[PDB]
Design a protein around this nucleic acid. Structure first.
Lengths: 451, 1326
RNA sequence: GGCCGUAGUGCUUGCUCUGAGUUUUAGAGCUAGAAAUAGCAAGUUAAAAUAAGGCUAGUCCGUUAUCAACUUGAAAAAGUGGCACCGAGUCGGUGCUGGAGGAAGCAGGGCAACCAAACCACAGCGUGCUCAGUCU
DNA sequence: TAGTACTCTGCCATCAGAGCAAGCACTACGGCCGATTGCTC
DNA sequence: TGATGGCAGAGTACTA
DNA sequence: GAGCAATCAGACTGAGCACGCTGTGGTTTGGTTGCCCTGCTTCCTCCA
């Protein structure tokens, strides 16, 4: 029923939209920018046929118009993971080189989820289709982007510049966010109660009750419809408790882990080459935040990957492989951090590997927020056990800042090295750990090995 | 961008190249292809070689030019004679000269009677009966006193003027002197009459046989001296005999003249020397000298005439008539003898022109030698032919008047005959009396070699100045041409300039200013130490002045002892003086100053300053001019300065040699600060006493800057011009230019980035000459080894036979005689061991019975043997069978043997290049590549140029199993370039201290270092070197043996190498110079415009300049319809200009109609075309094709073939034969590879069948022989023109592709100088 | 040793000349045979050309050097062609954009300890050499 | 059936010589060297 | 001073 | 007698000098070891 109510917001009905609000944007050029051109790199047969329908559709939409320009960079058919969509993305190496560099403002995924409070339990994930294509390009800067496309069936041979901002331009992901930002910025003024998360092209609306989400969704669709953006309706989780966002499951206000992801890590067999082990470690490392003591658990595997080492798979590496396989099977449910309440961090350090868990109060219990673990630097590796914990706190305390948003937490560790920092038996560590505004030490107490 | 290096290898006809990275890996990139085919890209390895035809010198062109000038001048002489005779020839016979001009013309074409002299058959036959040869007419004209026909007079005079004799002997040759021993007895009589103190008698002495002997002049003089009692060599009689026979003796000892007293009768300046010697010795000996002159005249005249002269004044004509009569008598006798004794071959002998004999001798082209060879056996197998055989042996049987030996007749004989005719016939014809002088001048005029061509400003090879613009004729040459200026320009046109100031001419070597400059330069750099001096002190300006004024101008050679005593002890009054910085005796001295002092006898004049210009002019004249007459005419302005005697002495003096410093450089330029010249500073410059190099390099003075500006400003040129200006062979210059161009293209290819390193290397690089040299040596030594068994040139080409003959058939180390028949059993030993240096020339090779007789087996020959054979070799050297250097090396031991320093030097050179040509190539490359300077105006060495010798790469290949076979394909050039780069880079990385002697920019310790400079490549030396190789100081890895060898093996095994043969437009002679007889064919070329070949003969086989592709229509059949045709046309060299001027009309003349200018394509030689399955053919001409494909045989097979054939001939050798025996089965695979490649590309089915059959039939022979013969089979599948090879006994001829039709439907490929850039043009579309 | 000379070899460039060779024509071929054919006689010499030829008209010049294709040019000359990787039968194929996150290696710079070597100054000693005194 | 037209295969290629001048590149010594000795005419 | 391209002649075969 | 052709001061003492070795000392350069940064580069996901 949602499709009928907002014909001007869905991409299936509205189609190729237009950024009516923002004006055409001039792409500035570097001080030494001089025209450059290169013959289009011959494209593969199947890859050539993949882009051809899009060029026809882009020509109809007005995105691509025939032109003659001195700038001509080839087109790249980036096959989609699903089948081979071969999106028409320009190589744009030269243009990126010739064009200026501007300050970026894209939010890193490790923070967006930090802003979500557990109070808002109802979610609404909206994805803007053709997001980059919405912003118009001034005709003066249109000649900057061009490519040679000749099809005898079409009957037109030459350069086809882009009237919008295409994919690949190194500053495209920045301008869209900036431009889309102000648009949704006023929406928050109209609806302060709601909590809308603006990704690069994915909008997630969080509300308190079911009715609040419904009211916001209708208002959000109308605002985006007027603004010209069009959202795909095929994949749009609306008024559902279980939603998928930023690669993370969101249920009961907990940053769960998708079951499909867990299968991929365990599904791979035992690696036999450094490439195979890197693939595994890459999959594993995305889930470091759930596995307690990830640094020490996967310590053996690290030197096996070492660039100049031999892949003589060791029994310790096997034991290390099994630990990761079993650790991911029973990964806990990390809760969404609530910025209003204070944080709590447990710190432990055994055998030169720092481990800990970031937790927050949940009723009478503490709920884990993120598991922090790091390899201590070689200089601190040889320190005595009393001094090693001080370095472990500093390493983990730096990690907590990337998640707590600078808010203070309770540094809890078994030993009482908090007084040791004042009178060590290092000046940088003192400033980081003695800042009462950002860090403090609570009652000294041990912690469970699992935590 | 990636760091890379370019390796080059230069040959006379090949330039390999290769690009490598920092890891010794050849890169690879896709290159765009232009043209009109579908192909738009191609992948190629960055390694290849360029092949081209060798360059040629200008020797042949110079000879042709000289011949053309000679023919033109001969025609002009004949024209002069005709112009003189025309006035009376008009009355006697108007059309005589016209009939003469058109003798070469068929009867129908002639505009007069077919008879040239008289115009009627009766008179022609009568004249030919009365005078069968021209010499009969010449003798009759000389002897008779009656009137003769003007036509015959002209004919004789024209023959004499046309064919003049040689101008070697100058002066006069009175033909009346024709005795030998009678005239020698007359000379002896005069000798006794004058020198009556001691008698001299030659009774019972075969003076005629001694003087007429074919031996050397010195040998004849020695024999005559020995056969004459009472006198020895170098006596008065001996000197007179030497002068008469031609040797130049010094009569000073004879008359104690205390002078040179050297007189060479032949030279005309020595005639004036003889004049002055007669002045010295009064008149007594003057008559004796006249007698000696007469004797010499008679000797040479008898040698060249061999006929009495008293009866007739026409000795040469009489000799020719006698030869004619003997020919007639011998011919009649031979005819009768053949008819009587043997009538079975009279026909073949006297009628068959195909075979040799009299018929082939006269009508055919057989020469005297061939005729004698054919007629000897028949003469021997006969009776009563003893005198005929004697004449045959003496080379006097059936002789033609005009023969190859007629080159010894001086022009004075013809002059005498002509003068006799003129004297006889001048009474009846007044104009002959009036024009005798000018006729004789016509005969005896030749342009001096210093005047050169008589051009008028439109000849590049011309230097001459004319006092007046009138036409030059032999009768006003002196009055028109300025001979003095001509000679001055002659000399100055070839001398060099001063590099310091490359605008001014260099000074004469013996110039007084040069002598002063050298003396002062050596003098300013001396320091002395005497008691009471804290330290040594430089020579003060006044001190140098006094020293020059008291020592150099008083003694020829200055010695430090005279310097200390005559001046320091006497003037400075310091007994204890210790000179320093100078050798005991000074090098430079005022040599010219002393020479003039004893002649002009004026110290005041020689020391005065205002006549220095006069003195410079005097020495310049003496150096420039060689002839006394011109020297005198130049010194006429200075006659007032010195009396006639002094003038004669000056004219006698002759200085030879040019200096290296221009007068401007030495004295003209002055310092801006004080206006002092280089000579002034050298005389006195404060107390610093700087020398010439310091003066010119000093920054404070302006000399440096001024010189630099002048040089750089005036130094401008182009690459081609500079390369050609360098000194060397034209082939090497061509290779250098090609190398520069390929370097430029490779730089363009690699992203326009200059390489880090450039490594280069260049290769180092008669029977008649050997025959003449051995003949001269045998004549000089008086030996008869050649007489014992004559040897032909082809046999003498053998090294062993040549050594045996040069050694006079005796051992070089023992006093024994070797046997020619027992050859191929002794050993050839180099004078210097082959280990020290590599030289297989005759200058170092010595043949001996046993090589164990050189004393020490390594050092130079043992002392005692060297002394004995040293007397024997002084003899062989006076004989000239060995060279100066050969003799020196042979006799070295006595003075000293090979020292340890000598061993060190020898081994050191074997690995370091020091050739000026390589240094020039490296300098050119460095200047082109590196052109950026620094803050101090110093060139920054962005690119380093490294030069290596081929020994390093050859040793690398032999040591690490990278054997090279040159007969497989042309990939070895590219492989050599790649290996050169690898070795050079590795060496400079391992040893950065050797860049000084490699990169362009104690003895025992040195020996082992250079000997083991390439050891770090080896693994087990038993020392075990580390796998990795570090720089030794830094951590840079230079050679990882684990992989780098695998990399080299992979690179050398790449099947794709860019081999490109440079297309060239053929230039040179129009066609073959042979003139063929008349025949009915269209291939003949007319020799003149109106001489139709079908009636007059002509040339054939014209060289094609470049083929042209023409698409047009021709008319075929009686219907004259237009059939579309596409064909190749060969534009010959003669018609190239005509075709280029108007191709449309040129093509339309040949028969094509409606040609297409756009479709016309010019195709030079070696144009490439691809067809079928990768088959490629090159263009030899418009009607023939060459192969254009290379066989990429695997390196495994290459190595097996090398090892089986034993290229270049214990446990290491033990394993090689076992390896070959194990891999015997590789020969079949090699044959299979050859067969499949030939089937795919060569397409020579019959030749392939023959090769396969021969291989099958020769399967049982040894593996060594089988591999050695399989090496030959690769000639079947090669790049270039087909050629004939041999497999064991079976021989395989050429398979030529005489059809150029399929290529018109092929793909035409245009390749750049490296082959990486192509333009494929499809010819099927046209 | 340097430097200095010279002695020789080789090669390159330029000039002036010589002897031949080749081509056409002249040197009456005769006898017997219709004829082809057969038998004899004769032979040595000369003229002209010797790169076709050119204009600049000289007693000059004409075979050396240089030269892939295309565009611009009168010419002299200047411009024209993506990279990386895995391979290998004369070369084949694959890839190529950003942003963001996690992990790992690498090189360079600064600073503070400890250590080696080198140079220079003084002094001593083994060996060898020059000079001075003495004898000879 | 005769007239072009193409393929194959053996033959063929202008050669000797003499002077003069200039330059380079490379290899061999020697040199300074007086006084003595040798031997040979 | 050897090559390597031209040339003549013999052989074979296709076409008017 | 005159010419051509090589040949290329002994010992002792002393001072003075040359090559090599050693002791002392000054200075300079260089190196390893250790702690820090700056930087550059390579390897694996998750998205337009």
């Amino acid at each position: 029923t949602w499709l009928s109510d907002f014909p001007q917001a869905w991409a299936e009905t509205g189609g190729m939209g237009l950024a009516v609000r923002q004006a055409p944007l001039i792409i500035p050029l570097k001080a030494t920018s001089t025209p450059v051109s290169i013959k289009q790199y011959p494209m593969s047969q199947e890859a050539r046929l993949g882009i051809k329908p899009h060029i026809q559709r882009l020509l109809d939409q007005g995105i691509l118009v025939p032109c003659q320009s001195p700038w001509n960079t080839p087109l790249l058919p980036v096959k989609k993971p699903g089948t081979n969509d071969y999106r028409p993305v320009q190589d744009l190496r030269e243009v990126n080189k010739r064009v200026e560099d501007i300050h970026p403002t894209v939010p890193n995924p490790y923070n967006l989820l930090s802003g979500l409070p557990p109070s808002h339990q109802w979610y609404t994930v909206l994805d803007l289709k053709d997001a980059f294509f919405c912003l118009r390009l001034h005709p003066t800067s249109q000649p900057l982007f061009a490519f040679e496309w000749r099809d005898p069936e079409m009957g037109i041979s030459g350069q086809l510049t882009w009237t919008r901002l295409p994919q690949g331009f190194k500053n495209s992901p920045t301008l869209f966010n900036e431009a889309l930002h102000r648009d949704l910025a006023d929406f928050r003024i109209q609806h302060p109660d709601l909590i809308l998360l603006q990704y690069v092209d994915d909008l997630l609306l969080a509300a308190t009750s079911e009715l609040d989400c419904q009211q916001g969704t209708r208002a959000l669709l109308q605002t985006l419809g007027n603004l010209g953006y069009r959202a795909s309706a095929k994949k749009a989780q609306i008024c559902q408790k279980q939603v998928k966002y930023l690669g993370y499951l969101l249920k009961e206000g907990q940053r769960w882990l998708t079951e499909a992801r867990k299968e991929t890590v365990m599904g791979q067999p035992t690696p036999k080459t450094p490439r195979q082990l890197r693939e595994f470690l890459g999959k594993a490392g995305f889930c470091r935040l759930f596995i307690p003591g990830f640094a020490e658990m996967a310590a053996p595997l690290y030197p096996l990957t070492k660039p100049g080492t031999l892949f003589n798979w060791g029994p310790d590496q096997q034991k290390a492989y099994q630990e990761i396989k079993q650790a991911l099977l029973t990964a806990p449910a990390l809760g969404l951090p609530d910025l209003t309440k204070p944080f709590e961090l447990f710190v432990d350090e055994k055998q030169g590997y720092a481990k800990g868990v970031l937790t927050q109060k949940l009723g009478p219990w503490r709920r884990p927020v993120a598991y922090l673990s790091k390899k201590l630097d070689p200089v601190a590796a040889g320190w005595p056990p009393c001094l090693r914990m001080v370095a472990a706190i500093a390493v983990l305390t730096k990690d907590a800042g990337k998640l707590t948003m600078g808010q203070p937490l309770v540094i809890l560790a078994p030993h009482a090295v908090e007084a040791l920092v004042k009178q060590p038996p290092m000046t940088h560590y003192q400033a980081l750990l003695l800042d009462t505004d950002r860090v403090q030490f609570g009652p000294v107490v041990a912690l469970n090995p699992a935590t | 961008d990636k760091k890379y290096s370019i390796g080059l290898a230069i040959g006379t006809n090949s330039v390999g190249w290769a690009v490598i990275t920092d890891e010794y890996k050849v890169p690879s990139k896709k290159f765009k292809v232009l043209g009109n085919t579908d192909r738009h890209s191609i992948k190629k390895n960055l390694i290849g070689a360029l092949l081209f035809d060798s360059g040629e010198t200008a020797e042949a062109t110079r000879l042709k030019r000289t011949a053309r000038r000679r023919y033109t001048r001969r025609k002009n002489r004949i024209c002069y004679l005709q112009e003189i005779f025309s006035n009376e020839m008009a009355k006697v016979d108007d059309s005589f000269f016209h009939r003469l001009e058109e003798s070469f013309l068929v009867e129908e074409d002639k505009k007069h009677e077919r008879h040239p002299i008289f115009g009627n058959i009766v008179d022609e036959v009568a004249y030919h009966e009365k005078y069968p040869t021209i010499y009969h007419l010449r003798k009759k004209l000389v002897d008779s006193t009656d009137k003769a026909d003007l036509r015959l007079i002209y004919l004789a005079l024209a023959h004499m003027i046309k064919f003049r004799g040689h101008f070697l002997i100058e002066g006069d040759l009175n033909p009346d002197n024709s005795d030998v021993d009678k005239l020698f007895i007359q000379l002896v009589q005069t000798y006794n009459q004058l020198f009556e103190e001691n008698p001299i008698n030659a009774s019972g002495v075969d003076a005629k046989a001694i003087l007429s002997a074919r031996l050397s002049k010195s040998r004849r003089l020695e024999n005559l001296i020995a056969q004459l009692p009472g006198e020895k060599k170098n006596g008065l009689f001996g000197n007179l005999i030497a002068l008469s026979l031609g040797l130049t003796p010094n009569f000073k000892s004879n008359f104690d003249l205390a002078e040179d007293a050297k007189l060479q009768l032949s030279k005309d300046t020595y005639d004036d020397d003889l004049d002055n010697l007669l002045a010295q010795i009064g008149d007594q000996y003057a008559d004796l000298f006249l007698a000696a002159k007469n004797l010499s005249d008679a000797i040479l005249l008898s040698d060249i005439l061999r006929v009495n002269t008293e009866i007739t004044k026409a000795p040469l004509s009489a000799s020719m008539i006698k030869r004619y009569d003997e020919h007639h008598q011998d011919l009649t006798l031979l005819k009768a003898l053949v008819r009587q004794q043997l009538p079975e071959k009279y026909k073949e002998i006297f009628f068959d022109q195909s075979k040799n004999g009299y018929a082939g001798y006269i009508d055919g082209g057989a020469s005297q030698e061939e005729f004698y060879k054919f007629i000897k056996p028949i003469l021997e197998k006969m009776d009563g032919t003893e005198e005929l055989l004697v004449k045959l042996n003496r080379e006097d049987l059936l002789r033609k008047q005009r023969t190859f030996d007629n080159g010894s007749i001086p022009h004075q004989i013809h002059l005498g005959e002509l003068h006799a005719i003129l004297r006889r016939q001048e009474d009846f014809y007044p104009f002959l009396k009036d024009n005798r002088e000018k006729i004789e001048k016509i005969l005896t005029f030749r342009i001096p070699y210093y005047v050169g061509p008589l051009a008028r400003g439109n000849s590049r090879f011309a230097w001459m100045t004319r006092k007046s613009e009138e036409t030059i004729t032999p009768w006003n040459f002196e009055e028109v041409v300025d001979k003095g200026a001509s000679a001055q320009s002659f000399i100055e046109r070839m001398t060099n300039f001063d590099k310091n100031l490359p605008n001014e001419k260099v000074l004469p070597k013996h110039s007084l200013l040069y002598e002063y400059f050298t003396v002062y330069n050596e003098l300013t750099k001396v320091k002395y130490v005497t008691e009471g001096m804290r330290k040594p002190a430089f020579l003060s300006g006044e001190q140098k002045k006094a020293i020059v004024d008291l020592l150099f101008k008083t003694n020829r050679k200055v010695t430090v002892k005279q310097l200390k005593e005559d001046y320091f002890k006497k003037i400075e009054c310091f007994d204890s003086v210790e000179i320093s910085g100078v050798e005991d005796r000074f090098n430079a001295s005022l040599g010219t100053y002393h020479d003039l002092l004893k002649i002009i006898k004026d110290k005041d004049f020689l020391d005065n300053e205002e006549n220095e210009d006069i003195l410079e002019d005097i020495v310049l004249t003496l150096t420039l001019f060689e002839d006394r007459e011109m020297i005198e005419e130049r010194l006429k302005t200075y006659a007032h300065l010195f009396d006639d005697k002094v003038m004669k002495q000056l004219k006698r003096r002759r200085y030879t040699g040019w200096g290296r410093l221009s007068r401007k450089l030495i004295n003209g330029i002055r310092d801006k600060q004080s206006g002092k010249t280089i000579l002034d500073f050298l005389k006195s410059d404060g107390f610093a006493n700087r020398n010439f190099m310091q003066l010119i390099h000093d920054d404070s003075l302006t000399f440096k800057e001024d010189i630099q500006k002048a040089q750089v400003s005036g130094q401008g040129d182009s690459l081609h011009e500079h390369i050609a200006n360098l000194a060397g062979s034209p082939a090497i210059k061509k290779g250098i230019l090609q190398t520069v161009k390929v370097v430029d293209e490779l730089v363009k290819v690699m992203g326009r980035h200059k390489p880090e390193n450039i490594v280069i290397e260049m290769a180092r690089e008669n029977s008649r000459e050997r025959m003449k040299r051995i003949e001269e040596g045998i004549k000089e030594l008086g030996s008869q080894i050649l007489k014992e068994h004559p040897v032909e040139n082809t046999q003498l080409q053998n090294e062993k036979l040549y050594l045996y003959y040069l050694q006079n058939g005796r051992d070089m180390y023992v006093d024994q005689e070797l046997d020619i028949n027992r050859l191929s059993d002794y050993d050839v030993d180099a004078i210097v061991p082959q280990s020290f240096l590599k030289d297989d020339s005759i200058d170092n090779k010595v043949l001996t019975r046993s090589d164990k007789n050189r004393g020490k087996s390594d050092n130079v020959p043992s002392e005692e043997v060297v002394k004995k054979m040293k007397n024997y070799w002084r003899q062989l050297l006076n004989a000239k069978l060995i060279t100066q250097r050969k003799f020196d090396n042979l006799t070295k031991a006595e003075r000293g043997g090979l020292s340890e320093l000598d061993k060190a030097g020898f081994i050191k050179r074997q690995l370091v290049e020091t050739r000026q040509i390589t240094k020039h190539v490296a300098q050119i490359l460095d200047s082109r590549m590196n052109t950026k300077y620094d803050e101090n105006d110093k060139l920054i060495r962005e690119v380093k140029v490294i030069t290596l010798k081929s020994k390093l790469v050859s040793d690398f290949r032999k040591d690490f199993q990278f054997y090279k076979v040159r007969e497989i394909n042309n990939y070895h050039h590219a492989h050599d370039a790649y290996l050169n780069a690898v070795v050079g880079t590795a060496l400079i990385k391992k040893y950065p201290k050797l860049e000084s002697e490699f990169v362009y920019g104690k003895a025992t310790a040195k020996y082992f270092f250079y000997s083991n400079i390439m050891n770090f490549f080896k693994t087990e030396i038993i020392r075990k070197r580390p796998l990795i190789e570090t720089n030794g100081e830094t951590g840079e890895i230079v050679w990882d043996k684990g992989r780098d060898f695998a990399t080299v093996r992979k690179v050398l095994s790449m099947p794709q190498v860019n081999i490109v043969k440079k297309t060239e437009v053929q230039t040179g002679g129009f066609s073959k110079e042979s003139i063929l007889p008349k025949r009915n064919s269209d291939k003949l070329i007319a020799r003149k415009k109106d001489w139709d070949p079908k009636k007059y003969g002509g040339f054939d086989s014209p060289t094609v300049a470049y083929s042209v592709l023409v698409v047009a229509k021709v008319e075929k059949g009686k219907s004259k319809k237009l059939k579309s045709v596409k064909e190749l046309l060969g534009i010959t060299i003669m018609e190239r200009s005509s075709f280029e001027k108007n191709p449309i009309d040129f093509l339309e003349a040949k028969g094509y109609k409606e040609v297409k200018k756009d479709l016309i394509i010019k195709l030079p030689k070696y144009s490439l075309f691809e067809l079928e399955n990768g088959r490629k053919r090159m263009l030899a001409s418009a009607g023939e094709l060459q192969k254009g494909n290379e066989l990429a045989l695997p390196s495994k097979y290459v190595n097996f073939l090398y090892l089986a054939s034993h290229y270049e001939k214990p446990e290491d050798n033990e394993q090689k034969q076992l390896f070959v025996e194990q891999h015997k089965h590789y020969l079949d695979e090699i044959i299979e590879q050859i067969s499949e490649f030939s089937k795919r590309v060569i397409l020579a089915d019959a030749n392939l069948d023959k090769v396969l059959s021969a291989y099958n039939k020769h399967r049982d022979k040894p593996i060594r022989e089988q591999a050695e013969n399989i090496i030959h089979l690769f000639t079947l599948t090669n790049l270039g023109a087909p050629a004939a090879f041999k497999y064991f006994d079976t021989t395989i001829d050429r398979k030529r592709y005489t059809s150029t039709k399929e290529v018109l439907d092929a793909t035409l490929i245009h390749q750049s100088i490296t082959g990486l850039y192509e333009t494929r043009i499809d010819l099927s579309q046209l």
